[PDB]
Structure formats: C-alpha cells, structure tokens
Design a protein around this ligand. Structure first.
Ligand SMILES: Nc1nc2c(ncn2[C@@H]2O[C@H](COP(=O)(O)OP(=O)(O)OP(=O)(O)O)[C@@H](O)[C@H]2O)c(=O)[nH]1
Ligand SMILES: [Mg+2]
Ligand SMILES: [Mg+2]
Lengths: 178, 126
C-alpha cells in the first residue's frame, strides 16, 4: 500500500484531535486535552486505491508554537482547520496558518476545513456568541477564505455527528496522491 | 461537569453600581476556586476577580477593578456575587464566571460545552 503523510494545523481547541480520532479510531474524545504532538495511522481506500495515511496532530496553542515545525517535514497534504464556534479561528487562517504552512510546506496542498459544523444549530453557542455580537461562521465565508488562500478544496464537517468526516480524509488523500 | 452561570448585568451610567451573580448547575466535583472573566469587542478576554476557599476581604483582583469590585460567596446558596461599584465605560463587556484551572486561563476560544451563560454589562453616558 501507498504511504502518505497528513498534518493538521489550526487554532487551539478548534477540533483537530477530535477530527483525526473520529476518522482514525471511529471514537470521539470526551474530555478536552490539548495536544502536544503525536500521530495516528489510518487505512483508507479512495477511488479504488489503498493508502496508509499517517495523521500528524499538532498543538494549536501558541504556547506550543516551537513544537509545530517538528511535524511538517515530508508532508503530503495539510488539513488547515478552523471551527464554526470561533470567528477568530477563521481570521487566523490567513494571518497565522497560511504563512506558516507556506514556509515549512511549500507546494503542499491545503484542504481548508470547517470543524464543529453541528454548532451552527446549537442554541447555547448562538446565544452566547450573539451576546458578544458574533455568530457561527457561515459556509460562504469559509468558501471565500478557501478562494483567497487558493486551497486545494474547502470542506465542512462535524466530528461529533460524523457528518463530512470521511469526505475530508478522502479529499485529503486525493490531494496527496495528485 | 459542574458549570457556572452569570446573571445581573444591565445598562448603567458611569459611576453606578451593579451586582452580578454566579450560580452553579450540574453534577460533579465542587468548584472551590472560581473567577469572573469579561470579554469586550476587539480586546482580549480579561480576568476580573476570583475567590477560593479562604473567606474574608483578601481575594484575587485584577488591578483594573481593585477597590471598586468586591467578590463574595452567599454562605447558604452555592452562589458567588461580583459587587461592581464606580463603574466606568472600560467595564463594558460580557461577563462570565468559570472555575480557575489551566483550561480557563489558556489563550483560546470559548468552548461553549465548558462555559455557561454570560451577562452583558454596558456602561454609558446615557
Ligand atoms: N460540538 C462539537 N464540539 C467539538 C467537535 N470537535 C471537537 N469538539 C470539541 O472542542 C474541544 C476541542 O477539541 P479538540 O479536537 O481537542 O481541539 P484541538 O484543535 O485538537 O485542540 P489543541 O490540541 O489544544 O490544538 C473539545 O471540547 C471537543 O469535544 C465537533 O465536531 N463538534
Ligand atoms: Mg488537539
Ligand atoms: Mg504531529
């Protein structure tokens, strides 16, 4: 089988680990524990081809910035994540994530991924973000960012409900195989 | 799994007063050390005040609110109050209460599975 390396990046708490773990082990972590760094293995079949995906998880917290470049060498595809409960996480895509991945992973395709899409309909999220004059990130603005940064693709998912998760990894695998 | 809920916010004129309340709900280990946090558009989330196991006037206060804000416990109702006096425009923010722990002090988004209800405080010339 073909081996490919996937690296996920994005703001702290934006759902990276839950996405990788739902996809690699079909389980959703109950308690939020910030990542330091670690990786996973998943087998995937896409378009008839068998691929062993290595899924490299990174810490989004700025406190672990110095560790992130440990994961980037020899990456075949980048999942660049934000979450819909955090408008700031989308703003940080062009301000932080794009420049960093361009530097360390030149010419590696980027899938821009909106995580936690279930929270668009969560009344508590909507109520509290509205209290702060915000709202869940809308598809149109994710897509616009994907155009701005010339992402290989734009996808939305929920690790919690599993909606869209397989498609993120199928699309990433295609990007890695191109 | 115990979650802290904020109430008592409103519109106030500069120099007025307001008392916020932080109530506990859900099941789990008691929260011994809790804090008040506030969030205004554009600025970073700000720690305001905290209270732990020791009663009395010595508590934890941001310099921004020292002497104007007083944090205390109800002694009967498992509720923390933030008495806010001499309010100023700079105090306008959405106020939340939460346990004091590594997750609540970390520089990252509000996780709404962990934060409860906030309460808006707006200070204004009107
Ligand atoms: N509602 C909802 N919550 C989610 C989802 N994915 C993750 N979360 C929640 O968001 C919090 C953070 O999730 P993680 O996957 O650990 O975040 P992360 O991006 O790996 O965080 P770092 O490792 O600190 O960079 C957890 O409390 C998760 O349960 C999702 O799809 N939906
Ligand atoms: Mg993580
Ligand atoms: Mg890694």
């Amino acid at each position: 089988a073909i081996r490919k390396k996937l690296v996920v990046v994005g703001d702290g708490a934006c759902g990276k680990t839950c996405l990788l773990i739902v996809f690699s082990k079909d389980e959703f972590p109950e308690v939020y524990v910030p990542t330091v760094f670690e990786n996973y293995v998943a087998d995937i079949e896409v378009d008839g081809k068998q691929v062993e995906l290595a899924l490299w998880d990174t810490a989004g917290l700025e406190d672990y910035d110095r560790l992130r470049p440990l994961s980037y060498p020899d990456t075949d595809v980048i999942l660049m994540c934000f979450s819909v409960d955090s408008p700031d996480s989308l703003e940080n895509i062009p301000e932080k994530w794009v420049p960093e991945v361009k530097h360390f992973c030149p010419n590696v395709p980027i899938i821009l991924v909106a995580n936690k899409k279930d929270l668009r309909s969560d009344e508590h999220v909507r109520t509290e973000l509205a209290r702060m004059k915000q709202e869940p990130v809308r598809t149109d603005d994710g897509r616009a960012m994907a155009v701005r940064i010339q992402a290989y693709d734009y996808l939305e998912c929920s690790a919690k409900t599993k909606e869209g998760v397989r498609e993120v990894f199928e699309t990433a695998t295609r990007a890695a195989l191109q | 799994a115990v979650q802290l809920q904020a109430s008592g916010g409103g519109f106030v004129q500069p120099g007025g007063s307001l008392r916020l309340s932080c109530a506990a709900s859900g099941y789990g280990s008691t929260i011994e050390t809790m804090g008040w946090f506030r969030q205004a558009p554009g600025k970073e989330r700000e720690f305001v005040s905290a209270i732990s196991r020791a009663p009395g006037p010595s508590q934890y206060y941001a310099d921004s609110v020292k002497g104007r804000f007083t944090i205390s416990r109800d002694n009967s109702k498992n509720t923390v109050y933030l008495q806010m006096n001499s309010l100023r425009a700079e105090d306008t923010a959405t106020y939340y209460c939460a346990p004091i722990n590594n997750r609540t002090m970390q520089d990252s988004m509000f996780l709404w599975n962990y934060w409860g209800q906030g309460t808006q405080v707006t200070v204004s010339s009107a």
